Amino acid sequence: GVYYATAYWMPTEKTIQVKNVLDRKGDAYGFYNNSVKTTGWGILEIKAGYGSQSLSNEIIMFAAGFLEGYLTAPHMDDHFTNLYPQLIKKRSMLNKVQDFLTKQDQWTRENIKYYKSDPFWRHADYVMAQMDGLFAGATKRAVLEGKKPMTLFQIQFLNAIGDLLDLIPS
Amino acid sequence: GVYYATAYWMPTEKTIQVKNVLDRKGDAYGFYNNSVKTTGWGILEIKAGYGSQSLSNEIIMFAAGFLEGYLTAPHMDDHFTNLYPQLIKKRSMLNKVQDFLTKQDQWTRENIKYYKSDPFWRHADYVMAQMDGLFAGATKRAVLEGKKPMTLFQIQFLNAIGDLLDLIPS
Amino acid sequence: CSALIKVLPGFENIFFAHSSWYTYAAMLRIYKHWDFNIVDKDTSSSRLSFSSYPGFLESLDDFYLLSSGLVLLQTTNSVYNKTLLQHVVPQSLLAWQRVRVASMMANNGKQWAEVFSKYNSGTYNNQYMVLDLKKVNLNHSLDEGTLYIVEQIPTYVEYSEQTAVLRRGYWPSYNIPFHEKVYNWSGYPILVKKLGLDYSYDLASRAKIFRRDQGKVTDMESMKYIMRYNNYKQDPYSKGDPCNTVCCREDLNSHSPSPGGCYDTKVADIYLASKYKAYAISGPTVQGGLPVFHWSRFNKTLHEGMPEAYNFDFITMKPIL
Amino acid sequence: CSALIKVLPGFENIFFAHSSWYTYAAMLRIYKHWDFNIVDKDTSSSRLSFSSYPGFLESLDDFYLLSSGLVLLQTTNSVYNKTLLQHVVPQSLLAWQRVRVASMMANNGKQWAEVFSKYNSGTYNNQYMVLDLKKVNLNHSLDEGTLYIVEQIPTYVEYSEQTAVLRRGYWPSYNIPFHEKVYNWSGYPILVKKLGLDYSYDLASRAKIFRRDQGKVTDMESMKYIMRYNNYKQDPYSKGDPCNTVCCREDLNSHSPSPGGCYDTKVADIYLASKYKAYAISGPTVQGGLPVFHWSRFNKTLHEGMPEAYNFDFITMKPIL
Ligand SMILES: *[C@@H]1O[C@H](CO)[C@@H](O[C@@H]2O[C@H](CO)[C@@H](O)[C@H](O)[C@H]2NC(C)=O)[C@H](O)[C@H]1NC(C)=O
Ligand SMILES: *[C@@H]1O[C@H](CO)[C@@H](O[C@@H]2O[C@H](CO)[C@@H](O)[C@H](O)[C@H]2NC(C)=O)[C@H](O)[C@H]1NC(C)=O
Ligand SMILES: *[C@@H]1O[C@H](CO)[C@@H](O[C@@H]2O[C@H](CO)[C@@H](O)[C@H](O)[C@H]2NC(C)=O)[C@H](O)[C@H]1NC(C)=O
Ligand SMILES: *[C@@H]1O[C@H](CO)[C@@H](O[C@@H]2O[C@H](CO)[C@@H](O)[C@H](O)[C@H]2NC(C)=O)[C@H](O)[C@H]1NC(C)=O
Ligand SMILES: *[C@@H]1O[C@H](CO)[C@@H](O[C@@H]2O[C@H](CO)[C@@H](O)[C@H](O)[C@H]2NC(C)=O)[C@H](O)[C@H]1NC(C)=O
Ligand SMILES: *[C@@H]1O[C@H](CO)[C@@H](O[C@@H]2O[C@H](CO)[C@@H](O)[C@H](O)[C@H]2NC(C)=O)[C@H](O)[C@H]1NC(C)=O
Ligand SMILES: *[C@@H]1O[C@H](CO)[C@@H](O)[C@H](O)[C@H]1NC(C)=O
Ligand SMILES: *[C@@H]1O[C@H](CO)[C@@H](O)[C@H](O)[C@H]1NC(C)=O
Numbered sequence: 001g002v003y004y005a006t007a008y009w010m011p012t013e014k015t016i017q018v019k020n021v022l023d024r025k026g027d028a029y030g031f032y033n034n035s036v037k038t039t040g041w042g043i044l045e046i047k048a049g050y051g052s053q054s055l056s057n058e059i060i061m062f063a064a065g066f067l068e069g070y071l072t073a074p075h076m077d078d079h080f081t082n083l084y085p086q087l088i089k090k091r092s093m094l095n096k097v098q099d100f101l102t103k104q105d106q107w108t109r110e111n112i113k114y115y116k117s118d119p120f121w122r123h124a125d126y127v128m129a130q131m132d133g134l135f136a137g138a139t140k141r142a143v144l145e146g147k148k149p150m151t152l153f154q155i156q157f158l159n160a161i162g163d164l165l166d167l168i169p170s
Numbered sequence: 171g172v173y174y175a176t177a178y179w180m181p182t183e184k185t186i187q188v189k190n191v192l193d194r195k196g197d198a199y200g201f202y203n204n205s206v207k208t209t210g211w212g213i214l215e216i217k218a219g220y221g222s223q224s225l226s227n228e229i230i231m232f233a234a235g236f237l238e239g240y241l242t243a244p245h246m247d248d249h250f251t252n253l254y255p256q257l258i259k260k261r262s263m264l265n266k267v268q269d270f271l272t273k274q275d276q277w278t279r280e281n282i283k284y285y286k287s288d289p290f291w292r293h294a295d296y297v298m299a300q301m302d303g304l305f306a307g308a309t310k311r312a313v314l315e316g317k318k319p320m321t322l323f324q325i326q327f328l329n330a331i332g333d334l335l336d337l338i339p340s
Numbered sequence: 341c342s343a344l345i346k347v348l349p350g351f352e353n354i355f356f357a358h359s360s361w362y363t364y365a366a367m368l369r370i371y372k373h374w375d376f377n378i379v380d381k382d383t384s385s386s387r388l389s390f391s392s393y394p395g396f397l398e399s400l401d402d403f404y405l406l407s408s409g410l411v412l413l414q415t416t417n418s419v420y421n422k423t424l425l426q427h428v429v430p431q432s433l434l435a436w437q438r439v440r441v442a443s444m445m446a447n448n449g450k451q452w453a454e455v456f457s458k459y460n461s462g463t464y465n466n467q468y469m470v471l472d473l474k475k476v477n478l479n480h481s482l483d484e485g486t487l488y489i490v491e492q493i494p495t496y497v498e499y500s501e502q503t504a505v506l507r508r509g510y511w512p513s514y515n516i517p518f519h520e521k522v523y524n525w526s527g528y529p530i531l532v533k534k535l536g537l538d539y540s541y542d543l544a545s546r547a548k549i550f551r552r553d554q555g556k557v558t559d560m561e562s563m564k565y566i567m568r569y570n571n572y573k574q575d576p577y578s579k580g581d582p583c584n585t586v587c588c589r590e591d592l593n594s595h596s597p598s599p600g601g602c603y604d605t606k607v608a609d610i611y612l613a614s615k616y617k618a619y620a621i622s623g624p625t626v627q628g629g630l631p632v633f634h635w636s637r638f639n640k641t642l643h644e645g646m647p648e649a650y651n652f653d654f655i656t657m658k659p660i661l
Numbered sequence: 662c663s664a665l666i667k668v669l670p671g672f673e674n675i676f677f678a679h680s681s682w683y684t685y686a687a688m689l690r691i692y693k694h695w696d697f698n699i700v701d702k703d704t705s706s707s708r709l710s711f712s713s714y715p716g717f718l719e720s721l722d723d724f725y726l727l728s729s730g731l732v733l734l735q736t737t738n739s740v741y742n743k744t745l746l747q748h749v750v751p752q753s754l755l756a757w758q759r760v761r762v763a764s765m766m767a768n769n770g771k772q773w774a775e776v777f778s779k780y781n782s783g784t785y786n787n788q789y790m791v792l793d794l795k796k797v798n799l800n801h802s803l804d805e806g807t808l809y810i811v812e813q814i815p816t817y818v819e820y821s822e823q824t825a826v827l828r829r830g831y832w833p834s835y836n837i838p839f840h841e842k843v844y845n846w847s848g849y850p851i852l853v854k855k856l857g858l859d860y861s862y863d864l865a866s867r868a869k870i871f872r873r874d875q876g877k878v879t880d881m882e883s884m885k886y887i888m889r890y891n892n893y894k895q896d897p898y899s900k901g902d903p904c905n906t907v908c909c910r911e912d913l914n915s916h917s918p919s920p921g922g923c924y925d926t927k928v929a930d931i932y933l934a935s936k937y938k939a940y941a942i943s944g945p946t947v948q949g950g951l952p953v954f955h956w957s958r959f960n961k962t963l964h965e966g967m968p969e970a971y972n973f974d975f976i977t978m979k980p981i982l
């Protein structure tokens with residue numbers, strides 16, 4: 001079935017709160033249609049920054065990722081479970097992968113901080129806000145359900161699967 | 171049916187004589203298969219400079235054209251008859267065409283004479299020997315049959331049909 | 341992965357499609373529709389629909405319909421040059437980040453390639469087809485800019501405009517680089533010498549099948565059909581191998597079955613795309629009477645969250661909010 | 662005139678063919694085989710077989726099999742730029758002379774274009790396809806140099822290497838220039854604006870028919886069939902016009918019949934060409950049940966030397982001495 005949800009930016013606390021309704025005044029709203037067993041697809045749809053509040057671009061991106069992580073965390077964890085052993089069979093490989101993604105993410109964040117004037121890095125910043133949001137959202141959902149939240153490394157690893165395929169045999 | 175013929179360069183008289191046999195010692199030999207009513211094609215085949223005599227390149231080309239003009243003159247004249255009125259309906263057009271082909275041929279011959287060192291013009295010379303031969307051959311055949319021979323202009327016009335198509339409306 | 345862009349003979353329509361190949365353990369799918377209200381002079385697109393997965397802020401596949409009127413397809417190349425792969429360093433942006441920045445900032449295929457090229461990581465070394473539907477005028481013309489082909493290896497992205505090829509009827513993509521400098525530098529010429537013509541760009545099995553059959557696409561049904569195509573027992577180009585064709589079924593390999601190969605097809609045309617619509621099927625192909633895939637036959641592979649059996653149909657994906 | 666080069670999907674063979682269109686008063690045909698024993702360091706070829714006519718020291722059509730391993734096809738472009746046509750002067754070599762000098766001196770398609778370009782007359786303004794069969798390795802590759810496309814207008818010859826297009830399956834030719842500078846300078850863009858898409862390179866009726874049907878060529882029989890193709894009553898791209906197709910029958914135009922259109926087809930493949938062999942049919946096409954052409958219906962046109970009726974078959978042309 002379909003789960004609706006809506007995120008609200010609380011500008012003062014600088015936090016998002018989520019509710020399980022579709023509310024068009026919300027800061028990111030939409031649904032997760034859990035149809036994977038029915039059609040072979042889940043369907044996710046997010047409309048963000050179209051509500052009452054007028055929001056900076058970075059917070060629109062954060063809210064969209066927050067909403068997506070909140071709705072799909074259970075499946076984020078299953079997809080990790082399923083693909084982790086397809087790519088990583090030896091702790092030696094895990095070492096190589098952790099080290100690369102850690103250095104890469106640190107390097108990405110430092111450039112975003114440094115190049116605050118640049119249109120290209122500003123858009124890298126939008127993508128990275130969405131990723132922080134996705135991390136923030138999936139955690140919220142985990143805590144609320146009483147599960148151990150996924151780590152940021154696990155989310156980096158999911159988004160990096162393509163880059164990891166050719167990289168790991170190196 | 172098939173007509174065979176053979177041309178012989180007579181180096182002293184500087185003339186070709188033709189005989190109506192296939193003789194492989196000849197200077198250009200081959201056939202005209204008059205199959206146009208049977209298949210929709212005539213077939214002409216010429217082997218030149220493969221006989222007893224060792225011949226300069228220009229005389230091989232002259233002999234090949236001589237042989238072709240000798241065998242196909244009747245049909246050269248029919249093709250002219252058929253295509254002339256397709257291209258020329260007014261003496262005004264004939265004036266334009268005569269003038270262009272005359273100036274063009276004169277210009278071609280002068281360059282061939284001037285550029286006796288140049289590989290490109292030397293090969294233009296081979297093509298023009300073949301054309302002189304074709305003219306020489308068709309005449310020989312005409313005289314021998316008692317017809318008015320085709321003029322060099324008529325042979326220029328046949329070879330120029332493609333260049334004339336876009337040119338005449340100009 | 342297999343991809344194909346096919347234009348009809350009077351430019352009456354244009355079809356584009358991608359069929360993903362990877363481990364069947366990846367078939368926990370999510371089709372995503374995002375619309376973010378971004379207001380920024382250097383943003384060209386903040387709305388996009390695309391095939392995807394849980395936790396992926398990208399398609400991976402790839403198959404994207406962007407609000408800039410670009411469509412993005414991609415198939416993965418290999419790089420067999422070990423010295424080249426030594427140049428990879430973490431001081432660079434990953435492929436998914438460059439795809440996302442480019443698909444957000446670019447309004448045409450040259451600008452997409454230029455932005456995607458910046459801080460190239462040399463990871464996920466792929467060919468992209470950037471199809472700019474703003475350049476397509478049905479029954480009239482495919483204007484300059486319609487198709488750019490972008491190929492990435494470590495240290496180097498090459499891109500070129502390929503609309504003149506596409507005007508002849510099609511652009512195919514099947515995991516072998518098109519640009520000669522790419523193909524050479526990635527080591528394909530030595531693979532062809534060592535392993536034969538399956539590694540060549542022109543005569544790999546899928547090159548031959550698309551060369552043979554793209555002209556059989558006349559409409560949506562026959563575009564679906566070529567992109568779901570296997571026929572391995574009868575197609576002479578398959579050499580009897582169920583992976584040697586457009587939509588691979590490596591689980592059917594008779595001496596070393598494995599749970600991987602082709603597991604989806606997404607397809608649209610220019611009319612569907614202008615409404616962010618596509619047809620998408622999840623699962624290995626059953627086309628032509630092939631057996632339904634069942635996890636029961638590979639029951640030691642984790643496949644948490646997925647159904648047991650894949651016998652779905654294409655459904656219509658479109659945003660609804 | 663229509664021409665087509667078509668490669669099979671696994672490069673198993675390559676076919677090339679030309680069907681001449683002109684006045685039926687030109688159908689007094691001679692197929693010629695010449696072999697001249699020339700000994701000259703700058704001669705590449707003095708042996709050639711080609712379709713021709715009485716008194717023509719050239720094909721005109723054109724369709725040539727040269728002993729240098731080049732094949733030459735050609736179709737005629739129009740030049741609609743009257744200012745450009747003003748540059749034509751008799752101080753230049755005619756097309757047939759440049760075709761002959763180039764086909765004698767050149768050993769590859771770039772050298773053919775360079776030699777043919779010298780003293781360009783701007784008369785008989787055509788596209789040539791120079792197919793270098795020495796570059797063709799069946800089941801393996803079409804190497805660089807396989808196809809050059811050469812286009813002449815007054816003052817300017819443009820040529821480029823087009824093997825990458827041909828590797829996709831085919832090269833078609835139908836009296837409209839391919840190179841954009843040529844097409845523009847000859848005035849085609851204003852004709853398209855004034856008369857519509859029959860004047861466009863991509864969407865002329867024969868562009869659409871070859872785009873639709875080239876993939877239907879699997880062998881010699883089906884190459885013959887596409888090159889003899891008319892089907893005008895049923896083919897939607899013909900718009901009901903018996904000249905709007907591959908092999909035109911303008912004598913069948915119902916309001917202004919004229920004795921002209923397609924009157925031959927010559928076709929070979931790389932095996933036939935290496936023995937200077939081709940299949941050649943003389944006459945308007947009767948394919949698909951069209952009426953045999955009879956001169957009796959146009960009995961005021963001179964057609965001295967020809968048969969009355971054209972219902973011949975393809976015959977084998979080859980030298981025999
Ligand atoms: C969620 O997905 C389900 C699963 O497909 C959708 O329900 C189907 O909708 C079609 C077309 O409207 C109906 O004809 C089917 O009978 C439904 N099938 C099943 C098996 O449920 C539903 O439409 C989707 N809803 C949203 C909001 O995405
Ligand atoms: C000259 O042309 C004729 C006309 O086609 C050729 O004769 C035909 O040859 C074929 C194949 O050998 C026979 O099966 C036919 O029965 C012949 N047909 C007719 C109607 O004559 C002849 O072979 C050619 N000869 C040369 C030297 O070119
Ligand atoms: C492009 O051309 C085709 C016609 O060839 C148009 O589509 C058809 O038009 C017919 C008759 O007008 C309709 O009945 C059909 O529904 C269409 N399909 C076919 C196969 O004929 C099409 O509309 C044109 N497209 C554009 C954008 O102009
Ligand atoms: C594989 O890639 C390597 C690394 O790029 C190539 O070696 C380089 O070649 C360039 C240009 O020829 C030289 O200037 C450099 O000296 C090389 N660089 C390094 C870091 O070694 C090699 O050419 C490629 N292999 C193949 C088969 O193409
Ligand atoms: C190119 O490949 C094809 C096979 O695909 C070869 O031609 C066939 O080979 C089969 C079986 O070996 C023969 O029985 C047939 O006569 C051929 N035709 C077909 C349609 O299979 C062909 O020999 C190869 N060509 C070259 C130059 O190697
Ligand atoms: C038609 O051709 C004419 C003659 O080449 C073109 O006019 C020339 O254009 C060039 C470059 O733009 C100018 O430098 C010359 O002044 C022109 N030359 C002459 C002799 O007039 C004209 O551009 C072409 N027409 C079209 C529609 O392209
Ligand atoms: C690619 O390799 C080929 C064949 O070895 C070589 O001849 C060719 O010039 C190379 N091309 C490029 C663009 O480097
Ligand atoms: C796993 O597969 C084997 C047959 O290969 C079977 O014996 C076992 O019970 C299977 N378990 C399942 C389908 O749950």
Ligand SMILES: *[C@@H]1O[C@H](CO)[C@@H](O)[C@H](O)[C@H]1NC(C)=O
Nearest residue numbers: 840841842843844845846850
């Ligand atoms: C040909 O004409 C087009 C359309 O007018 C023009 O935009 C284009 O750049 C021209 N191309 C060349 C090569 O001159």
Ligand SMILES: *[C@@H]1O[C@H](CO)[C@@H](O)[C@H](O)[C@H]1NC(C)=O
Nearest residue numbers: 955956957958959960961962
């Ligand atoms: C020429 O055609 C007309 C019919 O159009 C006919 O009356 C005349 O006799 C014809 N002459 C022939 C066929 O020789």
Ligand SMILES: [Cl-]
Nearest residue numbers: 508829830831
């Ligand atoms: Cl093609």
